[PDB]
Amino acid sequence: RGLKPRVLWQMDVTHVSEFGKLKYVHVTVDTYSHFTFATARTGEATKDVLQHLAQSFAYMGIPQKIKTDNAPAYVSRSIQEFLARWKISHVTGIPYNPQGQAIVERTHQNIKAQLNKLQKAGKYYTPHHLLAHALFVLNHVNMDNQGHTAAERHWGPISLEV
C-alpha cells in the first residue's frame, strides 16, 4: 500500500506533562488507516514541526493533503516552502470545525491512555522509549473489528519505513 500516495493526514502537537522538557508530543495520523507516528520533542515551533514532518514521511509515506491548526508554527513561510517540496496541499482549514481534527484528537487521547499505563516504566526509561512502546501497542497490537492492526491497514504485507 506504500507504493501509492496517502490521501489525508492530520497533524497536531499535544502536551504530555510527565515528559518534562520533552512534553511536546507531535502526532501525525493517517485518516484512512489511523496509523500514527508520534515523537517527543523539546519544542513546538516551526523547526520542531518540520523535523517531525520529515520523520513522518520516512515512517509513513507521503500524503496528498495535511491538515493542521493555524497556530504560527503551522502557517509560517518555512512550512509552506517545506510542504511544497513534496507537493503536499496544506489545509489549515476552518474554525468551528471539529471534524477537521477529530481523528488526531482521539489519537492524542489514545496515546495518553497508553502512556498512563507506563508511569512506573517512566522511572527507568526516557519519554522516547515510552512513546515508542505506546505507539507499538496502538499501531501493531490493537486490532479493529475485522481483526486488523493499523499497521496492516497502512502497509499490507511490507513496511516501507526509511
Nine cell digits for residue 97: 470545525
Report the amino acid identity of residue 106: R
d(CA 104, CA 112): 12
- How many angstroms separate the first and last alpha carbons of the chain? 15
Phi, psi of 11 (to 5 degrees): -135, 135
Beta bridge partners, 90, equal 66
DSSP 32-95: TT--EEEEEES--SHHHHHHHHHHHHHHH--EEEEE---SGGGSSHHHHHHHHTTTPEEE---T
Angle between helices 77-84 and 46-60 (to 10 degrees): 20
Q: Output the CA torsion sign for 80, 82, 85, 87.
A: negative
Q: Is 18 helix (H, G, I), strand (E, B) or coil?
A: helix
Are the C-beta atoms of 25 and 43 separated by less than 8 Å? no
Round to whole Å and give the CA distance between 92 and 74: 8
User: For this experimental structure, what is the resolution in angstroms?
Assistant: 1.7
Confirm if 63 and 30 have CB atoms less than 8 A apart: yes
CA 72, 20, 11, 96 dihedral sign is negative
Its domain, for residue 57, covers: 1-162
Q: Which method, experimentally, gave rise to this model?
A: X-ray
Q: Count the neighbouring beta carbons within 10 Å of the beta carbon of residue 51.
A: 14
What the block records as the C-alpha cell of 67 is 491538515
What does the DSSP 8-state code read for residue 142? -
The tally of CA atoms less than 13 A away on the side-chain side of residue 108 is 15
Residues 6 or more apart whose CB falls under 8 angstroms from that of 33 comprise 150, 153, 154
Q: Report CA-CA distances (Å) from 67 to 38, 116, 141.
A: 16, 27, 27
| Total number of domains constituting the chain | 1
CATH of the domain at 152: 3.30.420.10
Q: Which three cell numbers stand for residue 66?
A: 495535511
Please give the Cα distance from 10 to 52 (Å, whole number): 13
Strand 24-30 versus strand 6-15 pairing type: antiparallel
